[PDB]
Amino acid sequence: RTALPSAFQPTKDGKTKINPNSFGARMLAKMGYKEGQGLGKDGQGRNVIIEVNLRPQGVGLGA
Amino acid sequence: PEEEQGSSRNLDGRRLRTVTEAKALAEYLAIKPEMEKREKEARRKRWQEIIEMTERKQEEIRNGDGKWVEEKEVMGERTREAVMEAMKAGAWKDN
Amino acid sequence: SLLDKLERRNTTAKQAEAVEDSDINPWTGQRHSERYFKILKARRKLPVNKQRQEFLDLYHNNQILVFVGETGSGKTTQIPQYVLYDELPHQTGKLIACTQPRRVAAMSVAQRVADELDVKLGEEVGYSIRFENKTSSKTLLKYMTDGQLLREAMHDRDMSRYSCIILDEAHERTLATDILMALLKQLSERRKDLKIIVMSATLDAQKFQSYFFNAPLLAVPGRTHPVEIFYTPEAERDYVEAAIRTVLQIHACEPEGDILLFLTGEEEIEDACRRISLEVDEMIRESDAGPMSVYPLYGTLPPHQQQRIFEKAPQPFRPGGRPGRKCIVATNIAETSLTIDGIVYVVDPGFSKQKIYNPRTRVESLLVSPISKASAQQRAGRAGRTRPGKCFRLYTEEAFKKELIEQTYPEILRSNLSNTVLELKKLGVEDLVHFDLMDPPAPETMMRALEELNYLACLDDDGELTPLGNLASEFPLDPALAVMLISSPEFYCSNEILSITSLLSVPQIWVRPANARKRADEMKAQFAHPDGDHLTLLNAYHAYKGAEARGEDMKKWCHEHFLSYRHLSSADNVRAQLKKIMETHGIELVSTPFHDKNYYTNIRRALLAGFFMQVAMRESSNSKVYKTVKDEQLVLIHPSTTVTTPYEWVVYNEFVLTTKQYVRTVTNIRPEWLLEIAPVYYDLSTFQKGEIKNALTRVAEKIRRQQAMKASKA
């Protein structure tokens, strides 16, 4: 079996890029995924993952 | 504007800076005992934590690497392999 | 009979009420009791029976329906009984399914339905949970969790055994709930004979109708006691101090009534409880304030702690003085599905601990995030249950209107989708991106999940599910744990690896109380092993099994050794289920000898084969910081690790992102052993940056040179 590259490759800037040569990217392209548009029946899903906010401990809402 | 005209007077002949300073001293008298207590137990807790760090280092001294431990493991497996090849080839020369 | 007289999809509400009020119950040919009559009278008095005719008409006229109703209206219980009566499962042979978010809540709903229908639990009304299937062949209504529904869909996506499926508590937006909703939408698009019902308690009825393509929406009315909502004049930096001051002000000035405060963590809740106790003692000493009972309800509480939190408030010190109060500092338990009697005051700091899984480095964390408008509304609804209440928030009204989100983030975006992708592949969803999903995950997250499945051999390069992927989908565990259990037969440590996987699937059994930290550390050192945290957990499980065989009490032994008896029992049940699945699938169970010196090496090799993706290497000999190869993550070792000496390679079962990046549950392994276990993942030809991969390539070259020397000498 060929060594499939990781889908989320971390660059030098700290950002994770989606490698199109990955097995997961190839499977998504075969299924019908489009760049910049979410999946689903009508593409109404979120196109980005949920980012955790680094709020201070013991800090109220809106602070 | 009152800060600009702090030396001017009210209708009752009182300086606006004295009105402001009376209000500020009222606030200070309202807040002073509780912040005195706050800094008191702040000192207590802070140098109590300093103490606790000192006895945790004392206990660390009282009870006292990776390349080391995997070097030990690799020579152990290599010595075992030497043992098996030695009695596979018949290297009995003990005395 | 009543069921023969009632027609399928045409039964009237009056006919259903007459059948329920009849003295002969035809579910089992039995006689109605006084408790059953009282339950029927309560259901009739509830607002569900008032709209039961409209609900039956909507279910008859539409295959997919959404019912939005307030809590306590009876949508969880009265709707499924009426749905089953209209469906007439005796004339169809298919049961009714009730999808719930929590297994305990599903079991409670099934017990309530059985009590209302005057039938035994599991005979007519059944419950399905993880490793717990309390159902029989005569069951018509079965309450199951979202994960159980997903497993049933993976086993048979046709869903021929279920005629009508009602998914309740859809506002939680769980990943398994969303997968079940997508599967139900696909089943409704395929065959029109299946009935789909979505029960909601929020204002997302329009969104649910848009997801279900303009499904019929029925609204159940009904109000409760009033709650006055107050907001802070400004945002406070010290939420804990602001909550303590608000609780003190409510005790000193506000009237009698229990106060529930929103905390974030267990240690913070304990510190706030200690501070509140000291403040109440000072107030009793100086101003002679009323008594206050502090109760913690954080994420780590026992049943005794829950009972003490649910207990009554303390009495006043003197008659006619300040009345006693109960201050319950809860983290997220009291936000929803909690009924605390006497609760009048609510303190909402606006911060709560939520779990988020970043797929950029595949790191799972429990971080404090701002609360949502749905969470604030849930807290306001929880406050003032039996009487008028007051809820004060530590955020401005404009901040809660604008900065606070309307709904919380979903578990699909808060976790991974590898298990969902494996379940879809097992069910037959080849087009995962083109699958009919209302809220599908990100394409990058889906690609990462498929790449992880390909690395764990769950899917091929074309995305097709292989026999290993089918076995992993059949096994009720993670794909990595399934791969570890499959590869354990090669390492001849199948029983130990299955026990370790069961312990990893079960919650943490290590108990470290604040007042017994030294005893917990002594017990952990006594039951610990130098090979790794997984070896220490296996030794603790072996000691618990030996104590059970010797006849000591399991709970007493767990309390003496700072262990969790419930977690140990869950791990034992998971190990028994895994052994049964392995025996069904033909997987051999072998264990290395205790006197053999290769047992620990075989266990480490099996762990490396199972979890070679989460492997960390030390950056330097003088630095304790390790570098996990997953997106080059710089982390450390957790303080709960039992390894005194750090290893060259540490296989980590869990990665926790905090203020200090640490990795827990780390087992010792070598780079050569990791490369032998997973040559495809650790291939030097496809190895990226950096020096860790260079050292792995150097180790591979040394192994190749050793093999060449052995071939030359042989």
Residue numbers in the entry:
A (entry chain Cb): 237 to 299
B (entry chain D): 135 to 198, 205 to 235
C (entry chain Cc): 51 to 764
Sentences from the paper on this structure:
The spliceosome, a multi-megadalton ribonucleoprotein (RNP) complex, catalyzes nuclear pre-mRNA splicing, where introns are removed and exons are ligated together. Highly dynamic RNA–RNA and RNP networks form the active site of the spliceosome through a series of compositional and conformational rearrangements driven by RNA helicases, providing the necessary flexibility and accuracy of the splicing process. To ensure fidelity, the spliceosome needs to recognize and discard suboptimal pre-mRNA substrates while it assembles, is activated and eventually catalyzes the pre-mRNA splicing.
The absence of mature mRNA within the U5 region confirmed that this is the terminal ILS complex. Additionally, we could unambiguously position the DHX15–TFIP11–GCFC2 complex, which is responsible for disassembling the ILS complex in the following step. Similar to previous observations in the metazoan structure, in the ctILS structure, we found the DHX15–TFIP11 (G-patch domain) complex docked on a surface provided by SYF1, SYF2 and SDE2. It engages the 3’-end poly-U stretch of the U6 snRNA as substrate, which emerges from the U2/U6 helix II into the RNA binding tunnel of DHX15. Taken together, our ctILS model shows a high compositional and structural similarity with the recently published ILS structures, suggesting a high degree of conservation of spliceosomal structures among C. thermophilum, C. elegans, and higher eukaryotes.
